[PDB]
Subunit: 322 residues, 6 copies
Amino acid sequence: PRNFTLFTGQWADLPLEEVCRLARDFGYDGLELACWGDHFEVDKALADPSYVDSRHQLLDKYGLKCWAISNHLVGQAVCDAIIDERHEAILPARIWGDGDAEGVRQRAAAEIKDTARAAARLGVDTVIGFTGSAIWHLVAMFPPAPESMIERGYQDFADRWNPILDVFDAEGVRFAHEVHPSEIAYDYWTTHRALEAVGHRPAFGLNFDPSHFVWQDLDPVGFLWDFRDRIYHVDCKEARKRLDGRNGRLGSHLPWGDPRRGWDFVSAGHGDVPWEDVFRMLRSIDYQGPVSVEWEDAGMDRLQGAPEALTRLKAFDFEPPS
Amino acid sequence: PRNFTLFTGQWADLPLEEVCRLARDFGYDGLELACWGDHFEVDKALADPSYVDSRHQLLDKYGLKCWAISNHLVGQAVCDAIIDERHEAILPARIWGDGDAEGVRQRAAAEIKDTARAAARLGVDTVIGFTGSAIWHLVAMFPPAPESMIERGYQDFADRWNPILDVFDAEGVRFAHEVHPSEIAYDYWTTHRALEAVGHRPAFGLNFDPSHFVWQDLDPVGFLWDFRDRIYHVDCKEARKRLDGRNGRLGSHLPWGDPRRGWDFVSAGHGDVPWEDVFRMLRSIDYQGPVSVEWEDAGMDRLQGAPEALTRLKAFDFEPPS
Amino acid sequence: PRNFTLFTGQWADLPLEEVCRLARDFGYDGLELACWGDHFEVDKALADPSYVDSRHQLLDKYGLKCWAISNHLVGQAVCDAIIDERHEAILPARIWGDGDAEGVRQRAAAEIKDTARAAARLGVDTVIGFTGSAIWHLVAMFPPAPESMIERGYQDFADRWNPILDVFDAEGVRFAHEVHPSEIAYDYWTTHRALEAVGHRPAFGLNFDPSHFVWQDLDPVGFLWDFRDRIYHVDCKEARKRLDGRNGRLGSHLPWGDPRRGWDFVSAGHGDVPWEDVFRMLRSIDYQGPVSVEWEDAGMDRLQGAPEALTRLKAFDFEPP
Amino acid sequence: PRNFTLFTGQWADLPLEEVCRLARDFGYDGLELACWGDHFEVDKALADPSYVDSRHQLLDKYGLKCWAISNHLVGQAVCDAIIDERHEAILPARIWGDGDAEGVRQRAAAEIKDTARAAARLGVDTVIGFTGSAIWHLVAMFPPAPESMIERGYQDFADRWNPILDVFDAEGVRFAHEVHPSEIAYDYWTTHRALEAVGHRPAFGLNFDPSHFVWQDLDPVGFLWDFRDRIYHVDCKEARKRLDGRNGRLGSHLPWGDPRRGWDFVSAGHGDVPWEDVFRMLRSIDYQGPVSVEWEDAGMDRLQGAPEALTRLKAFDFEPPS
Amino acid sequence: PRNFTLFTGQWADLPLEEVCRLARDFGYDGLELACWGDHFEVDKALADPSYVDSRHQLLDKYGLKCWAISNHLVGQAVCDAIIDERHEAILPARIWGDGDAEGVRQRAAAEIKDTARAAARLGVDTVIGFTGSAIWHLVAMFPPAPESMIERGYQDFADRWNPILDVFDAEGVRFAHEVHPSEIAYDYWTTHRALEAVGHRPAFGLNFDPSHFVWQDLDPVGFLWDFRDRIYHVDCKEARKRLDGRNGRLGSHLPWGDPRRGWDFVSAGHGDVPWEDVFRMLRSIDYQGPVSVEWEDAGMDRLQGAPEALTRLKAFDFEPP
Amino acid sequence: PRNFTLFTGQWADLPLEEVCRLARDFGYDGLELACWGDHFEVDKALADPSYVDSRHQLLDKYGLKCWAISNHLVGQAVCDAIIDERHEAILPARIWGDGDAEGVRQRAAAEIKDTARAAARLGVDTVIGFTGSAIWHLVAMFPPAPESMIERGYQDFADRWNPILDVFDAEGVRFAHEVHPSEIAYDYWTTHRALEAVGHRPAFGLNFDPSHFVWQDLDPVGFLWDFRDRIYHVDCKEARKRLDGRNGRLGSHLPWGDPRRGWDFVSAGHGDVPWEDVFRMLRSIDYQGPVSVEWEDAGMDRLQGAPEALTRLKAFDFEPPS
């Protein structure tokens, strides 16, 4: 009886129609559409008056709903200080353009304004994404950066995103920033500071994803409570620690699935997230949106895990007392 | 009856002579000389054939020995991919030069070479320092970097450091890299990979500092065991966690002393480092160098903390059995 | 398998026939009959010669048995020092009477005596209940109470219960006291002390419910072992802690289901009770009674939770070798 | 260093002068005066114009200061719903009167107003105390009380204490409620609710005593941060858990020092209170008052424990830095 | 999926045909055959040229395969310093003989050489077993044993086993020693020392059973990584601690199922083995053998537990990406 | 609880007089005399009527007392089923005889009887010892041993020790069996069972030593409580765990001091024994005997560790309340 959604980003190698068939076979109520692959093309949603109708027709055909779209990939390029080949690999060529860092940040900003406009054409009220950060690479604090440098990072985020959020407001759409490493908000305390930076304006809320709370030792339940009025979307993504004295909290620059990582992504129920408290708290905060599933586990096949993760997560979804 | 030594880096605002006076009053047996302030000037050591004697005479005046010198500040600039104002603030103007990233890296490598030469002049066999890292900023792994980018980070370390280490070998001096965040080896597993990158050559060993093993959940005692042949120096630096669910393992880009940080440096005995096991393991490993103390605690005055830390650490220094 | 029963107290808003019908559909083998609502009326059981048979006939129609009845509500008012509107709300008007504290305590005692009589008529050998406590409200120990005041509390328990227990003995019925906050025995050590107050007499045994062991940090398995000869009934009631630094062990006088509580009642399998060890220990102590379920979870619907709790609990119920 | 005072409550069997001799011997800087024994007699303070200077003269003689007086015993009787022999034993006979509950509560309120007036005469700006509670005995919630009964106990607190606190305001004194079992505020959440019942008026603040935080599992550091603006006084009282599966968190109505209790009061440093974190946070919040020591340990002699407790507590009292 | 196998040892009171029927009903893919009961008789396998084919026919009849046989009972007698009625109870009379310690030890060695030969005839590449130990009884270290006495025990292992393992090499069969108490290798460190004793020769590998890693506080996952090139077989046996301050890690010489043991054997999923990490690690080390189940739980019936244990374990068996 | 003694067993390489001088310089009040070395010779104490006065004179000379003598080495050979080179190393040649197992057991019994007689001559009322065990070697339970074999081991203990204990009773002396691996009572539950075996007769009590409780995860405090009527003596010996996933609870047959052991003996205050609770409980159960120190730490020199261990342990010795 909550609505459950599959995040489409891990499936962007597949045509949308195949993802629709799969998600239906898996039992999902809907899709959280990634703004990449052929899933939701923001440029086409704006150029072609038919395009948004093709999206509904396709989803409707499989009995699927959509309450949100996601543009992590472009949002990352808005504030990142170091714009390089990793960005080139995740951006459309039209956003990359000549590869000039400031050029890319401006083009990414323009594209996020277009994402809100496309969301509203689609008729959804929430865009999930990332912001990037001018300051993330300073996280270790050696060599020391002055406080004015850290503050300028938050001011930079405000200066680039305030104009983006103006368009969000004009379109009647919300941004759900996913608190996550690499971002201006990645912590409980950085989320405070990032919210302060944009005057707590209602356009800028949060995509809650509990996975990165695990290795940082953040209480996801207390985060849900303290930021209750800014919980705009939920993605269930599971993480498992294996800290044996050798493996470390940072993962050692090692690929997903390498067992020498102190932590890794695993299918729901196979990890450490306290789903019991998380679900009870979404009710306590009267979170009314979809519950999305971002499926990732390097030791599993997605065809087996994605439906199993839905089953495991639903054991925590209860009818309220009547 | 192990020799205890005070690391001079947190004291570089002071003339060496004043540091010698305090270290003597505090009970230390010697100084670990920072290659900054007026403590150990690597250029003067090489240009002025009288300079090395001035160091011995000053040290001897206060009953102090020296078995090691340290150049974390220049070492950092050898491999760092992002060279900026933070490096400008820690470098002599003659190393910074024009500020060009690669130029600074080249001048920094040259200076570390001169550091080995200066060490040989002083008669000490170990240089403590940092390496920097071309890939540290990629730690979070979003946006993704291909495995090849990571591999080139370790190869970059090898290509910059092999020639510096060749000079160490020629001078009869060892490098003690301090495993620490923002370095090519910051971890148990990245230590293994960095040693491999230089073929386990004996010139490249390790400065053991347990402070950053705390937030990363690394066992300092197993590290000591597995890398026992490359433990070239020891710096006792203490760290305390305070992980209440809001504070996080990353520290939130928050200044030392801020109580919202998930962990902080504190004076020895006031944190979480397992000194009992560490000291027992140094004996098991037959570590026969000095035990140095790097004093740091933003909640305390150094003039009170430095002598107390020495007393707290000596409670773990026991006579071996006959 | 073991026989599993549903406690009827949380369903006293419903006519017994609807509870029978639900318990059958949920897969329960029987009912633990609350002595309130229309479930089990002690006075009718003794006055109307046909009443007990009406209970049998209803339960039998639904494929259900009964091994135990419960009178927590009346038992509470036997020893409580502070008799007030809370007791009024849980008592029938005949027991409340004029509302005079001593008179209530005495009428409540008479009614527990009658509960044992009613149980014997029904053919069950256990009555679950509460005792109340003259000293519960002294639990915090500021302002200090002298030790003589504490001792008088246990002696008050013995003085009021010994005559009730004489009647249980006459009727050949056991009393299964629910070790629970607000009772003379709420703890491992207060259980020892209460048992001694009554000379370890076999009439006064224990209803084991692990839920309140959770927040008090009591080992339910050791309690099972050390009190093995006096474990007379079991109610599986689950509780979950959420102790985040702000939420506290006492629950801050907050209603059930408030997330600011340090612990709360949740449905079986969703909390902290060590069911694996509890169930293995029930076999080791040769507990041969029913396994009852008292269903509570302010975050859930009883229609969904009651049958799920049954299923979750049956995963810990093993065939003997 | 900070100033440390001895709380006089556990010494009220002794004449004040004797306590001054002992506190001076133990190394304390001052006394938190209990409003009982012959330590601080509130009625004499107001009746006898020379009484208050007799207090200063006596304290001055021993080089002791006073920053606070304490009336736990009387304050308890203001809101308590059950008034009985426990109150008779802690109250002056002039307040107990005939022992009729409402008369006791009325008399106790009038005496707490007098305590504020006597504070102002003595020249101290803080009174520590208790409030008692109309609803504490409801803590277990069987047999159930309606939610309106709970709300009424908080309103009873406000109605009885608002007129007391008006006198505090008029006299220029503040009240430091000790969060503690048996009081309207005994928990983190009940403190919030109690502060809100009196509209967060600055007359009503808090005496911080970490000992009852231990068995309740309350984070005392987070408490200090969240109520930083209402920490009016600090009392260090230590507590040790021994929760072996048999002993329980409630203490089983067992006397202090009985080993079957799940927790007990012990001398500072023999228990579980995180003093390292507590003292650091006191600086972080800029608590500038005295650090008082309430000495209690049924397994020890006070003559030994009191000076030792001071010594262990001073180990956490750091000079700044400068 | 992986192939799952039932170890036949706890089932040796039953004829092999009954065991096959049950394992098929339970859902197993195969049998790990115990070299006792009528399950796999090494002497008959060798003397009777058609015995092996009766093993195959019987297994094929129930759709079962066999990748491994086990001879823990005879293996134990090879190195054991104290040979007594515990050994007489687990040996064929022909191996026990006169009961002279050295006599049994030599006869046991000869019989393990024959087990390797019987395995080769059957067509399996792995024998699971035990070694015994000349120094096990010295584990507590009071009264003190000289370090030379301890080296001698490992040398005794190498001297008795090297010749056995030459037969394994001749026959194209591996020995999977089960790291387990009372064995020369029972720990992480003792395994290192025993592999060194035989110069890490590839004939001597390991049977991985995580059960005894639990009470000894050994990381089964790190053991798998560090000994990855020598994990020759896997037996899923589950273990549960209950260390309440009275119960101790040694089990107090108390029988299986006694609630006063610090740890006990329990059915898969009921105890403490980190199956999630174990299974992921089996894939990371490219373990390609069967996953066997040794079923043991004194609190439970095997007819209920063996199929359930299979179901619980398979929830950790996931397809590769 | 406050006379402290030094156990002399680890000092038996030295003349008694030299142990006395050291124990006195260390600050010990007395000695727990081992029945080996030249410290206390059981046969001479019975044969020579001046021998016992020589002991008193030597201890008086150094201001030392004695309340107890120990014969671990001989006691272990009464019940041990496997009598070999290990017993030969710890036994006097007159007890070892020809080494035939049953004769050794029989002679060790006769010698323990004489140890009671000699305790009485010295004027002490307690002998500390071991019993050995016919069943210790069966602890791992593979190959299986029938339950009747286990029962026989406890009957064997009763059969051999009952007659020993009758001699203790005749002399007015008690036996304090040290619960310890390799004994018939090594556990909480095997202690119950051994006590039952001898009908809870008062001659057979217990020497409490917490060190072996650590690795077995036994609560030393609950033990003291449940066996309170049989705590005849206390030896404070400390132990420390290091269980990193590779080291095991059993210690891998590795010598003391090897870092690959899962636990080891360390000097008091350097391990895991809960001294705070241990000392409080000795006082709760009214233990009035001495507190002996058995000093052992392969990582330390006994000349520094023995006085230090006493200083640490004394920090838990509190004056009772007045």
